[PDB]
Amino acid sequence: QAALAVNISAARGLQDVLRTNLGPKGTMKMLVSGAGDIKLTKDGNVLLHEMQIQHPTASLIAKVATAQDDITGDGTTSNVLIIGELLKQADLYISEGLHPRIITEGFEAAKEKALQFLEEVKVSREMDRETLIDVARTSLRTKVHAELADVLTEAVVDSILAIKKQDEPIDLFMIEIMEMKHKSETDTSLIRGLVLDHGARHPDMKKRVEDAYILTCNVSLEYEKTEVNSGFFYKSAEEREKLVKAERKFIEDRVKKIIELKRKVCGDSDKGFVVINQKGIDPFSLDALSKEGIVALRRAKRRNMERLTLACGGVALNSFDDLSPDCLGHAGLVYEYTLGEEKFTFIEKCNNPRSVTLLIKGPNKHTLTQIKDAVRDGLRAVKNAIDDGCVVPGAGAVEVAMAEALIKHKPSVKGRAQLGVQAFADALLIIPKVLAQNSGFDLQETLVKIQAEHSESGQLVGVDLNTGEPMVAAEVGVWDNYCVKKQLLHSCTVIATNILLVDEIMRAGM
Amino acid sequence: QAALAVNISAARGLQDVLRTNLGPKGTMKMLVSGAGDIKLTKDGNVLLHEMQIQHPTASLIAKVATAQDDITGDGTTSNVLIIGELLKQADLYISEGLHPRIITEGFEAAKEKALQFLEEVKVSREMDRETLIDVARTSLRTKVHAELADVLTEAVVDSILAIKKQDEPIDLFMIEIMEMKHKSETDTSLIRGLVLDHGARHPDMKKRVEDAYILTCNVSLEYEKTEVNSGFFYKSAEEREKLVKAERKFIEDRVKKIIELKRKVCGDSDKGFVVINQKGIDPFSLDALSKEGIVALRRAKRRNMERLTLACGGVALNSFDDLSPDCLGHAGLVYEYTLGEEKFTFIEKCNNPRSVTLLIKGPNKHTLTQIKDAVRDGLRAVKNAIDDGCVVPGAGAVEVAMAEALIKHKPSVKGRAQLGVQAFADALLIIPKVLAQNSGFDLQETLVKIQAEHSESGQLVGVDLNTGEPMVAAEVGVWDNYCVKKQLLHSCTVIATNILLVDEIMRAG
Amino acid sequence: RKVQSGNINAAKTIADIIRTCLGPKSMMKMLLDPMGGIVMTNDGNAILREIQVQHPAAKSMIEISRTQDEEVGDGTTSVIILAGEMLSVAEHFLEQQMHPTVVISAYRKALDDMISTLKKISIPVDISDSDMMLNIINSSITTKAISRWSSLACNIALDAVKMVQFEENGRKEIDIKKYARVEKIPGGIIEDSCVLRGVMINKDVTHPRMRRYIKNPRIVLLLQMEEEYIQQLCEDIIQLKPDVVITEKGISDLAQHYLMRANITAIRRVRKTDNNRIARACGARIVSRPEELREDDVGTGAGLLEIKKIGDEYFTFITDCKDPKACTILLRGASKEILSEVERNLQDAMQVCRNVLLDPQLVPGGGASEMAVAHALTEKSKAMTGVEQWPYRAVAQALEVIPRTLIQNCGASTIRLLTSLRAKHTQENCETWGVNGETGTLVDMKELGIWEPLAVKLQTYKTAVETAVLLLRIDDIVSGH
Numbered sequence A: 001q002a003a004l005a006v007n008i009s010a011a012r013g014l015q016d017v018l019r020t021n022l023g024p025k026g027t028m029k030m031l032v033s034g035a036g037d038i039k040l041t042k043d044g045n046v047l048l049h050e051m052q053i054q055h056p057t058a059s060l061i062a063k064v065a066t067a068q069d070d071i072t073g074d075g076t077t078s079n080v081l082i083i084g085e086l087l088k089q090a091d092l093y094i095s096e097g098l099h100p101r102i103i104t105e106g107f108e109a110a111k112e113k114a115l116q117f118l119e120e121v122k123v124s125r126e127m128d129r130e131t132l133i134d135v136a137r138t139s140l141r142t143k144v145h146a147e148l149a150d151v152l153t154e155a156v157v158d159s160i161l162a163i164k165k166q167d168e169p170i171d172l173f174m175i176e177i178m179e180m181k182h183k184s185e186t187d188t189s190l191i192r193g194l195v196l197d198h199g200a201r202h203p204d205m206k207k208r209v210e211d212a213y214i215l216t217c218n219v220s221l222e223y224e225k226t227e228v229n230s231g232f233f234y235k236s237a238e239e240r241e242k243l244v245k246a247e248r249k250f251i252e253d254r255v256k257k258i259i260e261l262k263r264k265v266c267g268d269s270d271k272g273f274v275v276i277n278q279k280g281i282d283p284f285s286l287d288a289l290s291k292e293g294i295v296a297l298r299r300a301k302r303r304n305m306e307r308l309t310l311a312c313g314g315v316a317l318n319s320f321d322d323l324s325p326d327c328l329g330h331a332g333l334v335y336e337y338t339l340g341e342e343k344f345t346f347i348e349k350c351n352n353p354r355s356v357t358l359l360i361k362g363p364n365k366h367t368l369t370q371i372k373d374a375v376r377d378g379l380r381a382v383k384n385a386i387d388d389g390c391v392v393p394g395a396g397a398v399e400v401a402m403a404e405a406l407i408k409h410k411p412s413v414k415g416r417a418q419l420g421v422q423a424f425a426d427a428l429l430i431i432p433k434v435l436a437q438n439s440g441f442d443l444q445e446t447l448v449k450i451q452a453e454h455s456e457s458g459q460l461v462g463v464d465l466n467t468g469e470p471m472v473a474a475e476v477g478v479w480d481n482y483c484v485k486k487q488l489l490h491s492c493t494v495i496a497t498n499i500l501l502v503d504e505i506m507r508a509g510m
Numbered sequence B: 001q002a003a004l005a006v007n008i009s010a011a012r013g014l015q016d017v018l019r020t021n022l023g024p025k026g027t028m029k030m031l032v033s034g035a036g037d038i039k040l041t042k043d044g045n046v047l048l049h050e051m052q053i054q055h056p057t058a059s060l061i062a063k064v065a066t067a068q069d070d071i072t073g074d075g076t077t078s079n080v081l082i083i084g085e086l087l088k089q090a091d092l093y094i095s096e097g098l099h100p101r102i103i104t105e106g107f108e109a110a111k112e113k114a115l116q117f118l119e120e121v122k123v124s125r126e127m128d129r130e131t132l133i134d135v136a137r138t139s140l141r142t143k144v145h146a147e148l149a150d151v152l153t154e155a156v157v158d159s160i161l162a163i164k165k166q167d168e169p170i171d172l173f174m175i176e177i178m179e180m181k182h183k184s185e186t187d188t189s190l191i192r193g194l195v196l197d198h199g200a201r202h203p204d205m206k207k208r209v210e211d212a213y214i215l216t217c218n219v220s221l222e223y224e225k226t227e228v229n230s231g232f233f234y235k236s237a238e239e240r241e242k243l244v245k246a247e248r249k250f251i252e253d254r255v256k257k258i259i260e261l262k263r264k265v266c267g268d269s270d271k272g273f274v275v276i277n278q279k280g281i282d283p284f285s286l287d288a289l290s291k292e293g294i295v296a297l298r299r300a301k302r303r304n305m306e307r308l309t310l311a312c313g314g315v316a317l318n319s320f321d322d323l324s325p326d327c328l329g330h331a332g333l334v335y336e337y338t339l340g341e342e343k344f345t346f347i348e349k350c351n352n353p354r355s356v357t358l359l360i361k362g363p364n365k366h367t368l369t370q371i372k373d374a375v376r377d378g379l380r381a382v383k384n385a386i387d388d389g390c391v392v393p394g395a396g397a398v399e400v401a402m403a404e405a406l407i408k409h410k411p412s413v414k415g416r417a418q419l420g421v422q423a424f425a426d427a428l429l430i431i432p433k434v435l436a437q438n439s440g441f442d443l444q445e446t447l448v449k450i451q452a453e454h455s456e457s458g459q460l461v462g463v464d465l466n467t468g469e470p471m472v473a474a475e476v477g478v479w480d481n482y483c484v485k486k487q488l489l490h491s492c493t494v495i496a497t498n499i500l501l502v503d504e505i506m507r508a509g
Numbered sequence C: 001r002k003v004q005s006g007n008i009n010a011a012k013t014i015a016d017i018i019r020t021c022l023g024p025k026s027m028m029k030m031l032l033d034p035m036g037g038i039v040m041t042n043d044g045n046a047i048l049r050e051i052q053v054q055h056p057a058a059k060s061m062i063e064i065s066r067t068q069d070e071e072v073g074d075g076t077t078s079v080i081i082l083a084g085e086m087l088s089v090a091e092h093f094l095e096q097q098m099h100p101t102v103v104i105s106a107y108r109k110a111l112d113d114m115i116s117t118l119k120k121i122s123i124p125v126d127i128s129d130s131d132m133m134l135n136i137i138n139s140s141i142t143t144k145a146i147s148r149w150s151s152l153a154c155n156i157a158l159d160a161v162k163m164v165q166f167e168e169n170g171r172k173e174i175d176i177k178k179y180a181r182v183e184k185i186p187g188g189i190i191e192d193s194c195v196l197r198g199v200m201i202n203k204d205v206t207h208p209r210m211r212r213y214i215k216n217p218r219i220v221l222l223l224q225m226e227e228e229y230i231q232q233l234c235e236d237i238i239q240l241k242p243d244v245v246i247t248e249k250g251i252s253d254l255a256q257h258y259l260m261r262a263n264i265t266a267i268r269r270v271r272k273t274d275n276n277r278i279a280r281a282c283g284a285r286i287v288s289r290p291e292e293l294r295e296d297d298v299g300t301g302a303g304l305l306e307i308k309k310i311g312d313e314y315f316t317f318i319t320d321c322k323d324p325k326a327c328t329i330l331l332r333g334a335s336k337e338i339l340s341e342v343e344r345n346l347q348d349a350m351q352v353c354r355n356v357l358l359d360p361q362l363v364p365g366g367g368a369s370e371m372a373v374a375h376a377l378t379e380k381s382k383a384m385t386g387v388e389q390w391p392y393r394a395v396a397q398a399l400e401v402i403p404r405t406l407i408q409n410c411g412a413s414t415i416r417l418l419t420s421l422r423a424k425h426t427q428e429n430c431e432t433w434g435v436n437g438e439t440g441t442l443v444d445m446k447e448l449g450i451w452e453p454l455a456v457k458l459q460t461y462k463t464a465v466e467t468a469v470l471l472l473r474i475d476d477i478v479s480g481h
């Protein structure tokens, strides 16, 4: 029995760690990398997947958030707190002489009663702009300083609606993330198109083009090697440069057809053309295309060329010998914004690019990466709200209404199984107890307040983080996804089963 | 908070010690005195009043059971079990951040709610022979080795029934408890009269007297001082013998004065006479009175003389010169009982003694002291049963029904005190958890069946020790007193209130 | 006696590990790896496999269990527990001052009585009824992910061993390693899995000029001077006009130049066991070399030749409509984790069919088989003339630990139910009144599917007693070589 007490006391310490960083009133935690980087964050999955823990037992709990993040991406903080309180309450019954296996069946019966109660609390209302604003405010508040709440709320919601229509399945790959320095934190905004890293290097390029055609290519216009069966037949160093022009002759002629393609495809004034060649371009080749006002880009990433096909429509060409106007894309106001450090190209004003870019702005890297965690955590909560139209009220409204149901639940499986239901009910009530401490109010006053509310109809009250009163989470705009709470009842019970089923601990070479 | 954790775990260890001696199927504890005395008992009062504990915090709990035993006379073992569980559950909330002051307010509400619950489930059954046997079975079963139950049950029941009439309240001083050795343990029975330690020792005495007039005396019949203005003055050993002739005139002449009263008051045949003088008697006075059919007893206790006045009715005399017939008593069969070594006087079949004798028999000293306490603990259990016309079911049946009333109860004073009621609910359910272990069965499986028992009626459900199923305590003859549970919940809340409110522990010398 | 007692605590501690790892409510264990990692398995086979032990008597317990894993994939947990519990009775070894030979004769004498007692509670099985076999195999499908396709696992497990069994030789030998080669194919799901009624070779396709789909294939089993033999060894095969050239050893690069010229499939690295299944499938014959081929080395009777790229991986299907003393399983799955679940779980069910088909006799499991045995030896000890009766009774009291763990793992009162479990075998028939592993209370085994085969328990008690005999026959440890 003493061997089981180690895993109980092991996760109890992990409960005391991740209890203060839950919610916006909660604290943050630092990641000392040792190399020179410092990170600040609240999400428990980040505090465990990248972190290394002293105890061996708690390291197994770290992998729970790793598998949990792949399903939902949130709620990992509350998962460990339910697990910590379950085994805390179960220790009081095992101390009297009860076996752990009897308590596990009690949780297995409480899982169905708690899961079946979830069907009643969720609301099948239509998800709209006003509904998701309540959702984004619930998640992003725990990742910012209470100032970027309204700033990032309007960005995450519009990013989702602009990339999904007609019940189309949504995907997170469509939203690109970018970061820029020398700006304030409240200047976060959205981008219609895609922001490119490397721009053009020539003074003769147009700073901004109201309308220009796009041409996708992968041909390097620099001094390349020989293509035909020949070689360097020479007798001195001066003759070497003559055959360099021959290896450039195949390259120089290919750029002359690009000007012909521009002159044939809208070669009149009030027009433009923008090349998006991923490979490098010679300064001489840029000098020839810059005279015609063609803003040619070079040294881009492979990920942007795939996104450029979706936004611009130009098909990738592998050789200029097969240059045809069929593979030409199109873009709106194509420009390059000048910042304090570097220049970056914009292809905004597309009709339907099927890809947006959330341009994040922050002065420091630890602040820029913190918001990057808020984006992917805030985006997935809205992804889970639309892909699963059912949502539930937060503020512990689901846990309290479930906990009230388990006390008024008779044993429908076994006799002694009711004891685990008594323990599983006291575990879910830790969520209003945790947020009571982060808010600074009495831990007990918050519990009986939301519990004393009873009526002859639907009544789901919650915790008021600012006052502590029993407040309705559904009306004030607090909503959680159906899949998030669904995984807590499956993850916390399956994991807590595996910890209580350990009888002895043997060292296998340690 | 640390001042409580030393007191919290101090009771938890005390809970694991005394939990194995609750009920008959539990174990016993040994008392090592160090001088040579060894004792065995399950009553928690003896495990705390006479025992020395290492911790001072646990020493205060010992004084609670000491006063608890003085009021009700039983239930002191479960009093400490609830206390140890009250602070156990209070520590679960103290870790979350609740002050102990609010928890005491929750116990105050549940204590008054549970006290109201006793008024509903108590049974005011008529007191008679058959019902009190069911009660005395509950008090004596946990003080013996599962064989003296039916033996001692009939004793304590008929003992109290003999001294209760005309609506007179009960008094424990109306029972003379004596002990006899050189006999077995199952020979404990009731003696209608009074048993005297020392009796007549002369061959010329009658073995038994069917009827004798008992004369009460306090006169010295041994060598005393001179009663006139004189003294003891001699010159040799032979001259000293002449003073014996003078001093003995105060003793010898008083022997004949009893003979003159014998021929006066019923001096014919088919009669008798018994002298119960408290002082010692000379053999010449024994031989003089033995021939006259007069049984002379000596070396009696101060309290036995008080009961002897009630047995026969003769008033206590202080001098034979003040002898009169008015101070003469009367009794039935007066004889002498014979043990293996010693012999005792028996004056059973009295007229109106108003004082019975519970004669205990056992072979050993340490075993006789175990039954010594079971008598005082058995007599007091039924004493409260008749004085308190209402009784409650035993078998821990009050605790499982009490948990149903308090869970279905909301405080009308504040919200946060509701959790103190939740702790008081699990603290009372430790008794069916303790007895389930002392019986050798599973702790929780026994609690489920007694808690799951429900019906559309008034249903009293308890714990079966022999099988482990739900037992209706009223059907099997398992009952307690109404003042026991009332003093339990009234006492256990005050102590938990006094200890939990200790903020700091200072070393005061 | 110090060496006699050393083997007690050396095995008693090993049995303590897997004492709670028995039954469907088996308790998990925490094994601390040297790198801080933890493995939370519960199978006693893999737990003790990784735990390094210092005593030699405990190391023999691991070598005995591995051989049991090849015969039967389950029950090995009780093999060590009985051998550990049989040796845990130190009263008869040292305190009674008996010789080890006294107790070895007692256990060997009790061995012959336990074997006869288990056959008295046996029951025949009608293997023709697939529904009656479903109740037997479901003992392993329960508490698994394959419960969603239990009927499919029954058809795959039961029919596969029927193809390996050859009942014309009299012995009816069943070999899973040679005749039940289990292979995986990417793509599909567990529902898409089926049993191929022939041979399948896992040879990938190297050249494009190969016969893709042929309904009537033909199988052939087998600079200047260098290409002399290469062209001639290849030209002797096309005299029969085959469609797939199956070679034992590897083929050179120039010999394949004529295999791709002929546009025929080129297979190589084939075992000798694999070619015999093909020779019995399509009636071909295995020739030593390619130069001495004859007319009989053809593929008349074959089903089809298919080297289609299924799941981004080629697979040579040379199946037929016959069962040539062999079979081939086709496991389909969307991922490797799902494939790894069905591949290992079917091996537990496939070995149960091996025990029934060799001897269709079952026994009442769930603690019912032990009490049926222990009750027979107790009454026989009162009339057994000799000092061996005392250790003869210790076996009656030692085999009660198997149901003791099942009730203790459930958490119920093991002392109350086990004592009453004796009365059910004392008064009523011993073939019933078992123990429910999930519930914990007593129930008859005729109404439940806890029936285990006969070969599983025979090898258990034979190896459980033989292990205690080999450990008590030791009296000193010799160091040297």
Ligand SMILES: Nc1ncnc2c1ncn2[C@@H]1O[C@H](COP(=O)(O)OP(=O)(O)O)[C@@H](O)[C@H]1O
Residues within 6 Å of the ligand: A021, A022, A023, A024, A042, A043, A044, A045, A073, A074, A075, A076, A077, A078, A138, A139, A142, A394, A395, A396, A463, A465, A473, A478, A480
């Ligand atoms: N002020 C609040 N009001 C209501 N619910 C809150 C509040 N703060 C936090 N929560 C709840 O805490 C839960 C977890 O939030 P968060 O820590 O951001 O995600 P995770 O716990 O998955 O990392 C949310 O489901 C939310 O309902």
Ligand SMILES: Nc1ncnc2c1ncn2[C@@H]1O[C@H](COP(=O)(O)OP(=O)(O)O)[C@@H](O)[C@H]1O
Residues within 6 Å of the ligand: B021, B022, B023, B024, B025, B042, B043, B044, B074, B075, B076, B077, B078, B138, B139, B140, B141, B142, B393, B394, B395, B396, B397, B435, B463, B464, B465, B480
């Ligand atoms: N055999 C039994 N089965 C169930 N309950 C019992 C049994 N014997 C006693 N009890 C209960 O135990 C309690 C304590 O009994 P007792 O031993 O007389 O007091 P104490 O334990 O304080 O000495 C009583 O309230 C009674 O209801």
Ligand SMILES: Nc1ncnc2c1ncn2[C@@H]1O[C@H](COP(=O)(O)OP(=O)(O)O)[C@@H](O)[C@H]1O
Residues within 6 Å of the ligand: C021, C022, C023, C024, C073, C074, C075, C076, C077, C078, C139, C365, C366, C367, C402, C406, C435, C436, C437, C438, C450
């Ligand atoms: N459903 C069940 N009910 C009761 N007992 C069972 C049940 N299933 C298995 N058992 C018991 O568990 C024991 C171990 O079974 P198994 O797990 O197949 O072997 P091992 O534990 O060696 O892997 C068997 O002896 C059997 O009696």
